[PDB]
Each structure stands twice: as structure tokens, then as C-alpha cells.
Amino acid sequence: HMLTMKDVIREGDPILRNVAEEVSLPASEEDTTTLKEMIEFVINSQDPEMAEKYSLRPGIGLAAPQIGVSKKMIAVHVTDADGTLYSHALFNPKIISHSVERTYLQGGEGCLSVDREVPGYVPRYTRITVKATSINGEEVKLRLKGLPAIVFQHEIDHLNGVMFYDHINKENPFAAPDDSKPLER
Numbered sequence: 001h002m003l004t005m006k007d008v009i010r011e012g013d014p015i016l017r018n019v020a021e022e023v024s025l026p027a028s029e030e031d032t033t034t035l036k037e038m039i040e041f042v043i044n045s046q047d048p049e050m051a052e053k054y055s056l057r058p059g060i061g062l063a064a065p066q067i068g069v070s071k072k073m074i075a076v077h078v079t080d081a082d083g084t085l086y087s088h089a090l091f092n093p094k095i096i097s098h099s100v101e102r103t104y105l106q107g108g109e110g111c112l113s114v115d116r117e118v119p120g121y122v123p124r125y126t127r128i129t130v131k132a133t134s135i136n137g138e139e140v141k142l143r144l145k146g147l148p149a150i151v152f153q154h155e156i157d158h159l160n161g162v163m164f165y166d167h168i169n170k171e172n173p174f175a176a177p178d179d180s181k182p183l184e185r
């Protein structure tokens, strides 16, 4: 069994606004399988062949709530400008520290759960330290910046019932956030 867009729920579903439940670790086969299918989905969505074979909208991350599972699980598969790949399948991911300084994609953010465009900068912390447990069972401590840090914040926001547009400015989507700068290479 594998995930497709049919499994992705859209905004309006209360689950997207609830706080995902902590995953009991060591993880069960069920939760492991859920997470395995999540990272498979994200990676397949970036392969033209597979994306068409299952009509998948390309994306660089996914949170369990998005597929109807209210548990703390995320999948991230993003490559930065330097060609550095950040591929993670995680249980109970949490930001233990974030920079005061912020950043943002000038073209905004999109979400697989949102069938519409919401223009405006989505302020994000430039640097974050994340602690979680990999699908492989090992605890991990990741220090991210730039695009990878942005994707992690977006996915973890999903686990706390937060949507990307909740961060967009009030009646001035393009105002420069205090102490910040557009995403750098």
C-alpha cells in the first residue's frame, strides 16, 4: 500500500487544527509503516515517472495529520542550492531552539492541504535545532538553516495545528519582517 493525493486531506478537516499525539517509542509496526509510506510519497512526488503514475503533486515534505493520522510524524526530502540533500523520516520532531533572526521565501509558501494560493511572506526562523527519532529508531539532533529549516518549520507547524498562512502579515503580506532577510543562497 502506498499514498496518493486521494489520501491527502484539505483544509477544513478538523484534524489539521488539532495537536498531533506523541508517538510511542520504540515505534510500532503500524507507525513505522505510516512513516515509511510518508517519505516514499515525498520522494516519489519528485520523480516525474512516479508522480504521473500516481498523479502526485510534487512536494518537499509531509506531516502525518495531512494524511489523516494525528500523530507526531514528518517526512522531509529537500535539496538546497548547493545540491545538499536533507532526507528525513521522523517521529516526534521538535524544535528545541531557533534563531531570533528570521527569513522567508520571497515567492511565499504552498501546501498540499491547501487547494489555493495565499500570497505573502511566511516568516521563518533562519536557523533551528531539531531533535527527533529517525524511522531507523535512532534519536537525531539536526541543525538546519535556509530552505531545509523552512520546510521543517512548515511540517512541524502541521503537528501543532498551525497552517502556513497563519504567519502571513495582517493586511500587508509583503511587509519586511522585523530582523530578517529574504532567503539567501
Ligand SMILES: CCCCC[C@H](CC(=O)NO)C(=O)N[C@H](C(=O)N1CCC[C@H]1CO)C(C)C
Pocket (backbone or CB within 6 Å): 057, 058, 059, 060, 061, 062, 063, 066, 105, 107, 108, 109, 110, 111, 112, 113, 150, 151, 154, 155, 158
Ligand atoms: C517551503 C515550505 C515547505 C513546503 C512543504 C509543501 C508540502 C506540504 O504541504 N507539507 O506540509 C510543499 O512542497 N510546497 C511547495 C512549495 O510551497 N514550495 C516548493 C518550493 C518552495 C515553495 C514555493 O515557494 C508547493 C510547490 C507544493
Ligand SMILES: CCCCC[C@H](CC(=O)NO)C(=O)N[C@H](C(=O)N1CCC[C@H]1CO)C(C)C
Pocket (backbone or CB within 6 Å): 105, 106, 107, 182, 183, 184, 185
Ligand atoms: C518571487 C521570487 C523572487 C526571489 C528572487 C531572489 C533573487 C535574489 O536576490 N537572489 O539572491 C531569488 O532568486 N531567490 C531564491 C528563490 O526564491 N528561488 C530560486 C528558484 C526559484 C525560487 C524558489 O521558489 C532563493 C531564495 C531560493
Ligand SMILES: [Zn+2]
Pocket (backbone or CB within 6 Å): 110, 111, 112, 113, 154, 158
Ligand atoms: Zn503543508
